[PDB]
Protein backbone atom coordinates (compact mmCIF):
# COMPACT_ATOMS: atom_id res chain seq x y z
CA UNK A 1 0.00 0.00 0.00
CA UNK A 2 1.06 3.60 -0.64
CA UNK A 3 1.44 6.07 2.24
CA UNK A 4 0.88 9.83 1.97
CA UNK A 5 3.65 11.58 3.96
CA UNK A 6 2.21 14.13 6.40
CA UNK A 7 3.83 17.09 4.63
CA UNK A 8 2.00 16.32 1.34
CA UNK A 9 -1.28 16.43 3.30
CA UNK A 10 -0.22 19.48 5.30
CA UNK A 11 0.24 21.68 2.20
CA UNK A 12 -3.23 20.45 0.96
CA UNK A 13 -1.91 18.70 -2.15
CA UNK A 14 -4.62 15.95 -1.87
CA UNK A 15 -7.24 18.70 -2.58
CA UNK A 16 -5.62 19.26 -5.98
CA UNK A 17 -5.29 15.51 -6.59
CA UNK A 18 -9.06 15.09 -5.88
CA UNK A 19 -9.84 17.86 -8.41
CA UNK A 20 -7.90 15.81 -10.96
CA UNK A 21 -4.59 17.71 -10.99
CA UNK A 22 -1.26 15.99 -10.30
CA UNK A 23 1.31 18.05 -12.24
CA UNK A 24 0.88 16.29 -15.60
CA UNK A 25 3.02 17.72 -18.42
CA UNK A 26 4.88 20.08 -16.08
CA UNK A 27 8.66 19.79 -16.34
CA UNK A 28 10.48 20.03 -13.00
CA UNK A 29 14.28 20.04 -12.77
CA UNK A 30 15.69 18.76 -9.50
CA UNK A 31 19.08 20.45 -9.51
CA UNK A 32 20.82 18.30 -6.98
CA UNK A 33 22.95 15.15 -6.52
CA UNK A 34 21.25 13.10 -9.23
CA UNK A 35 18.10 10.97 -9.06
CA UNK A 36 18.12 7.18 -8.80
CA UNK A 37 16.01 6.42 -11.86
CA UNK A 38 15.78 2.68 -11.03
CA UNK A 39 13.57 3.46 -8.01
CA UNK A 40 10.11 1.95 -8.71
CA UNK A 41 8.37 4.90 -6.99
CA UNK A 42 9.94 7.48 -9.35
CA UNK A 43 9.77 8.11 -13.06
CA UNK A 44 12.65 10.20 -14.37
CA UNK A 45 11.91 11.81 -17.77
CA UNK A 46 15.46 13.02 -18.53
CA UNK A 47 18.34 15.09 -17.25
CA UNK A 48 22.04 15.81 -17.55
CA UNK A 49 25.11 15.87 -15.30
CA UNK A 50 27.36 18.92 -14.81
CA UNK A 51 29.64 17.04 -12.36
CA UNK A 52 32.94 16.37 -14.20
CA UNK A 53 33.71 13.11 -12.35
CA UNK A 54 30.12 11.73 -12.11
CA UNK A 55 28.70 11.85 -15.60
CA UNK A 56 25.52 9.85 -15.00
CA UNK A 57 22.65 12.05 -13.61
CA UNK A 58 20.54 8.87 -13.01
CA UNK A 59 22.98 7.56 -10.45
CA UNK A 60 22.61 9.30 -7.11
CA UNK A 61 25.69 8.55 -5.01
CA UNK A 62 24.63 10.80 -2.12
CA UNK A 63 20.86 10.02 -1.67
CA UNK A 64 19.77 13.62 -1.22
CA UNK A 65 18.62 14.29 -4.83
CA UNK A 66 16.49 11.12 -4.81
CA UNK A 67 14.79 12.10 -1.55
CA UNK A 68 14.08 15.63 -2.84
CA UNK A 69 12.77 14.15 -6.09
CA UNK A 70 10.31 11.88 -4.24
CA UNK A 71 8.79 14.80 -2.38
CA UNK A 72 8.28 16.60 -5.72
CA UNK A 73 6.95 13.66 -7.68
CA UNK A 74 6.95 10.16 -6.16
CA UNK A 75 4.45 8.16 -8.26
CA UNK A 76 0.80 7.63 -7.44
CA UNK A 77 0.47 3.84 -7.23
CA UNK A 78 0.20 1.13 -4.52
CA UNK A 79 3.76 1.52 -3.19
CA UNK A 80 6.05 3.67 -1.14
CA UNK A 81 5.14 7.33 -0.77
CA UNK A 82 3.01 9.72 -2.84
CA UNK A 83 4.62 12.89 -4.22
CA UNK A 84 3.16 16.37 -4.22
CA UNK A 85 2.94 16.36 -8.09
CA UNK A 86 3.00 12.61 -8.86
CA UNK A 87 2.49 13.09 -12.63
CA UNK A 88 5.17 15.74 -13.10
CA UNK A 89 7.93 15.21 -15.68
CA UNK A 90 10.93 14.86 -13.47
CA UNK A 91 14.44 15.81 -14.66
CA UNK A 92 17.67 14.82 -12.85
CA UNK A 93 20.04 17.79 -13.21
CA UNK A 94 23.09 16.59 -11.34
CA UNK A 95 25.30 19.41 -10.09
CA UNK A 96 26.41 17.93 -6.70
CA UNK A 97 28.78 15.00 -6.28
CA UNK A 98 28.62 12.10 -3.81
CA UNK A 99 29.85 14.34 -0.98
CA UNK A 100 26.94 16.75 -1.35
CA UNK A 101 28.95 19.67 -2.77
CA UNK A 102 29.35 21.33 -6.16
CA UNK A 103 31.27 24.22 -7.65
CA UNK A 104 29.27 27.34 -8.47
CA UNK A 105 29.91 26.83 -12.17
CA UNK A 106 28.32 23.35 -12.01
CA UNK A 107 25.15 24.80 -10.40
CA UNK A 108 25.09 27.57 -13.03
CA UNK A 109 25.58 25.02 -15.85
CA UNK A 110 22.59 23.05 -14.48
CA UNK A 111 20.37 26.17 -14.36
CA UNK A 112 21.41 26.94 -17.95
CA UNK A 113 20.56 23.35 -19.01
CA UNK A 114 17.14 23.76 -17.32
CA UNK A 115 16.49 27.01 -19.26
CA UNK A 116 17.62 25.48 -22.57
CA UNK A 117 15.40 22.43 -22.05
CA UNK A 118 12.28 24.47 -21.21
CA UNK A 119 11.84 23.41 -17.60
CA UNK A 120 8.76 24.95 -15.99
CA UNK A 121 10.09 24.64 -12.44
CA UNK A 122 13.53 24.41 -10.85
CA UNK A 123 14.09 23.08 -7.35
CA UNK A 124 17.43 23.84 -5.67
CA UNK A 125 17.67 22.13 -2.25
CA UNK A 126 21.15 23.57 -1.90
CA UNK A 127 22.94 26.69 -0.83
CA UNK A 128 26.06 28.51 0.29
CA UNK A 129 26.72 31.61 2.38
CA UNK A 130 28.05 33.78 -0.42
CA UNK A 131 26.60 34.58 -3.79
CA UNK A 132 28.25 35.44 -7.08
CA UNK A 133 27.29 37.72 -9.94
CA UNK A 134 27.24 34.69 -12.28
CA UNK A 135 24.93 32.76 -9.90
CA UNK A 136 22.55 35.71 -9.60
CA UNK A 137 22.62 36.15 -13.40
CA UNK A 138 21.66 32.47 -13.98
CA UNK A 139 18.69 32.51 -11.61
CA UNK A 140 17.54 35.89 -12.88
CA UNK A 141 17.77 34.59 -16.43
CA UNK A 142 15.73 31.48 -15.59
CA UNK A 143 13.04 33.68 -14.03
CA UNK A 144 13.11 36.14 -16.95
CA UNK A 145 12.60 33.11 -19.21
CA UNK A 146 9.46 32.00 -17.38
CA UNK A 147 10.78 29.32 -14.95
CA UNK A 148 9.50 29.11 -11.37
CA UNK A 149 12.70 28.88 -9.28
CA UNK A 150 12.44 27.53 -5.73
CA UNK A 151 15.27 26.99 -3.25
CA UNK A 152 15.95 25.94 0.36
CA UNK A 153 16.26 29.04 2.54
CA UNK A 154 19.17 27.34 4.36
CA UNK A 155 19.79 25.55 7.66
CA UNK A 156 21.69 28.34 9.47
CA UNK A 157 19.15 28.91 12.25
CA UNK A 158 19.14 32.35 13.96
CA UNK A 159 21.95 34.88 14.43
CA UNK A 160 20.38 37.70 16.42
CA UNK A 161 18.85 40.20 14.02
CA UNK A 162 20.98 39.12 11.01
CA UNK A 163 19.59 37.31 7.99
CA UNK A 164 20.92 33.78 7.63
CA UNK A 165 19.20 32.91 4.36
CA UNK A 166 21.78 31.46 1.98
CA UNK A 167 22.25 31.73 -1.79
CA UNK A 168 20.63 31.28 -4.21
CA UNK A 169 17.54 31.47 -1.94
CA UNK A 170 18.56 34.99 -0.83
CA UNK A 171 18.18 36.45 -4.36
CA UNK A 172 14.84 38.26 -4.91
CA UNK A 173 14.10 36.24 -8.09
CA UNK A 174 14.18 32.93 -6.17
CA UNK A 175 11.49 31.71 -3.80
CA UNK A 176 13.31 30.96 -0.50
CA UNK A 177 11.65 28.18 1.52
CA UNK A 178 11.99 27.62 5.27
CA UNK A 179 11.02 24.53 7.25
CA UNK A 180 8.22 23.84 9.70
CA UNK A 181 7.23 20.66 11.50
CA UNK A 182 3.75 18.98 11.63
CA UNK A 183 2.55 21.50 14.22
CA UNK A 184 3.61 24.45 11.99
CA UNK A 185 6.53 25.34 14.31
CA UNK A 186 9.64 26.63 12.60
CA UNK A 187 12.43 23.98 12.74
CA UNK A 188 15.30 25.24 14.93
CA UNK A 189 17.79 24.96 12.03
CA UNK A 190 15.56 26.87 9.53
CA UNK A 191 17.27 30.07 8.20
CA UNK A 192 15.68 33.45 8.98
CA UNK A 193 15.60 36.91 7.46
CA UNK A 194 13.54 39.27 5.34
CA UNK A 195 14.45 37.06 2.29
CA UNK A 196 12.54 34.10 3.77
CA UNK A 197 9.48 33.82 1.53
CA UNK A 198 7.28 30.86 2.54
CA UNK A 199 7.50 27.76 4.74
CA UNK A 200 6.76 24.09 4.05
CA UNK A 201 7.20 20.77 5.99
CA UNK A 202 10.88 20.04 6.55
CA UNK A 203 10.93 17.82 9.65
CA UNK A 204 10.84 13.98 9.48
CA UNK A 205 9.87 13.96 5.80
CA UNK A 206 9.52 10.43 4.37
CA UNK A 207 10.61 10.08 0.76
CA UNK A 208 12.44 7.84 -1.75
CA UNK A 209 16.10 6.86 -1.27
CA UNK A 210 18.45 5.02 -3.66
CA UNK A 211 18.26 1.24 -4.01
CA UNK A 212 14.48 1.09 -3.62
CA UNK A 213 14.45 2.44 -0.07
CA UNK A 214 12.51 5.16 1.79
CA UNK A 215 13.40 7.24 4.79
CA UNK A 216 12.76 10.33 6.89
CA UNK A 217 15.08 13.36 6.29
CA UNK A 218 15.09 16.86 7.87
CA UNK A 219 16.05 20.17 6.32
CA UNK A 220 15.02 23.19 4.33
CA UNK A 221 16.08 20.84 1.47
CA UNK A 222 12.93 18.85 2.32
CA UNK A 223 10.74 21.93 2.52
CA UNK A 224 11.78 23.35 -0.92
CA UNK A 225 10.41 20.43 -3.05
CA UNK A 226 6.97 20.74 -1.37
CA UNK A 227 6.82 24.22 -2.91
CA UNK A 228 8.36 23.11 -6.23
CA UNK A 229 5.77 20.28 -6.36
CA UNK A 230 3.01 22.77 -5.45
CA UNK A 231 4.10 24.96 -8.35
CA UNK A 232 3.77 21.94 -10.64
CA UNK A 233 0.21 21.21 -9.29
CA UNK A 234 -0.73 24.84 -9.89
CA UNK A 235 0.62 24.83 -13.43
CA UNK A 236 -1.22 21.56 -14.20
CA UNK A 237 -4.50 23.23 -13.22
CA UNK A 238 -3.58 26.62 -14.84
CA UNK A 239 -1.16 25.80 -17.67
CA UNK A 240 -1.09 29.39 -18.97
CA UNK A 241 -0.21 30.96 -15.64
CA UNK A 242 3.20 32.60 -15.73
CA UNK A 243 5.86 31.98 -13.16
CA UNK A 244 4.96 35.43 -11.77
CA UNK A 245 1.41 34.24 -11.24
CA UNK A 246 2.45 30.89 -9.74
CA UNK A 247 4.74 32.63 -7.28
CA UNK A 248 2.14 35.21 -6.27
CA UNK A 249 -0.50 32.49 -5.91
CA UNK A 250 1.66 30.66 -3.38
CA UNK A 251 2.69 33.80 -1.51
CA UNK A 252 -0.78 35.26 -1.39
CA UNK A 253 -2.53 32.16 0.02
CA UNK A 254 -0.22 30.99 2.78
CA UNK A 255 -1.51 30.27 6.24
CA UNK A 256 0.17 33.04 8.20
CA UNK A 257 2.26 31.73 11.13
CA UNK A 258 4.53 33.97 13.22
CA UNK A 259 6.61 37.05 12.50
CA UNK A 260 7.80 37.12 8.88
CA UNK A 261 11.42 37.27 9.96
CA UNK A 262 11.06 33.67 11.21
CA UNK A 263 8.21 32.38 9.07
CA UNK A 264 8.06 34.52 5.93
CA UNK A 265 4.47 34.60 4.68
CA UNK A 266 3.65 31.32 6.44
CA UNK A 267 2.80 27.78 5.35
CA UNK A 268 1.94 27.21 1.69
CA UNK A 269 -1.56 26.03 0.90
CA UNK A 270 -1.69 24.72 -2.67
CA UNK A 271 -5.51 24.28 -2.57
CA UNK A 272 -5.94 28.00 -1.96
CA UNK A 273 -3.08 28.91 -4.35
CA UNK A 274 -4.76 27.07 -7.23
CA UNK A 275 -8.09 28.92 -6.92
CA UNK A 276 -8.59 32.04 -9.03
CA UNK A 277 -9.22 34.28 -6.03
CA UNK A 278 -6.45 34.37 -3.48
CA UNK A 279 -6.37 35.16 0.21
CA UNK A 280 -4.62 33.91 3.34
CA UNK A 281 -6.23 31.31 5.60
Amino acid sequence: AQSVPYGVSQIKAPALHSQGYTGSNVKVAVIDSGIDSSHPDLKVAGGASMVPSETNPFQDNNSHGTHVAGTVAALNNSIGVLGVAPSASLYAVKVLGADGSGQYSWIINGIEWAIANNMDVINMSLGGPSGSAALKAAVDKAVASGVVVVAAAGNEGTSGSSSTVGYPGKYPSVIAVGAVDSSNQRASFSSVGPELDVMAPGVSIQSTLPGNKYGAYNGTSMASPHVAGAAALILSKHPNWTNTQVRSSLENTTTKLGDSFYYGKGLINVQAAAQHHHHHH
Binding site: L96, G154, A187, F189, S221
Partner: protein, 63 residues
Amino acid sequence: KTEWPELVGKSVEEAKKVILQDKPAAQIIVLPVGTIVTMEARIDRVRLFVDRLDNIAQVPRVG
Protein backbone atom coordinates in the same frame (compact mmCIF):
# COMPACT_ATOMS: atom_id res chain seq x y z
CA LYS B 1 28.78 22.37 21.81
CA THR B 2 27.51 22.75 18.22
CA GLU B 3 29.73 25.52 16.78
CA TRP B 4 33.49 26.08 16.86
CA PRO B 5 34.22 29.71 15.97
CA GLU B 6 37.67 29.44 17.65
CA LEU B 7 38.71 26.98 14.88
CA VAL B 8 38.53 29.46 11.99
CA GLY B 9 42.07 30.03 10.73
CA LYS B 10 43.38 26.76 12.25
CA SER B 11 44.55 23.75 10.23
CA VAL B 12 41.95 21.23 9.18
CA GLU B 13 43.97 18.66 11.26
CA GLU B 14 43.58 20.61 14.48
CA ALA B 15 39.90 21.25 13.73
CA LYS B 16 39.18 17.51 13.29
CA LYS B 17 41.04 16.73 16.54
CA VAL B 18 39.15 19.33 18.57
CA ILE B 19 35.74 18.50 17.11
CA LEU B 20 36.24 14.76 17.80
CA GLN B 21 37.10 15.58 21.45
CA ASP B 22 33.81 17.44 21.83
CA LYS B 23 31.75 15.14 19.63
CA PRO B 24 33.52 11.76 19.27
CA ALA B 25 30.85 10.24 16.98
CA ALA B 26 30.95 13.23 14.54
CA GLN B 27 30.89 12.46 10.82
CA ILE B 28 33.36 14.99 9.57
CA ILE B 29 33.46 15.95 5.91
CA VAL B 30 36.02 18.30 4.46
CA LEU B 31 34.84 20.50 1.58
CA PRO B 32 36.30 23.50 -0.26
CA VAL B 33 35.02 26.86 1.04
CA GLY B 34 32.94 28.61 -1.66
CA THR B 35 31.13 25.47 -2.84
CA ILE B 36 27.37 24.97 -2.76
CA VAL B 37 26.05 22.06 -0.65
CA THR B 38 22.90 20.09 0.16
CA MET B 39 20.59 21.64 2.72
CA GLU B 40 19.50 18.59 4.73
CA ALA B 41 20.12 18.69 8.50
CA ARG B 42 22.28 15.93 9.91
CA ILE B 43 22.92 16.25 13.63
CA ASP B 44 25.79 13.75 13.44
CA ARG B 45 27.64 15.74 10.73
CA VAL B 46 30.20 18.50 10.89
CA ARG B 47 31.30 19.93 7.57
CA LEU B 48 34.73 21.61 7.57
CA PHE B 49 35.09 24.24 4.86
CA VAL B 50 38.74 24.81 4.00
CA ASP B 51 40.62 27.34 1.97
CA ARG B 52 43.21 26.31 -0.68
CA LEU B 53 45.88 26.00 2.12
CA ASP B 54 43.73 23.50 4.11
CA ASN B 55 42.96 25.97 6.91
CA ILE B 56 39.39 26.35 8.20
CA ALA B 57 37.68 29.24 6.39
CA GLN B 58 34.16 29.22 7.90
CA VAL B 59 32.87 28.52 11.46
CA PRO B 60 32.37 24.74 11.82
CA ARG B 61 28.89 23.84 13.01
CA VAL B 62 26.90 20.68 13.46
CA GLY B 63 24.36 20.11 10.67
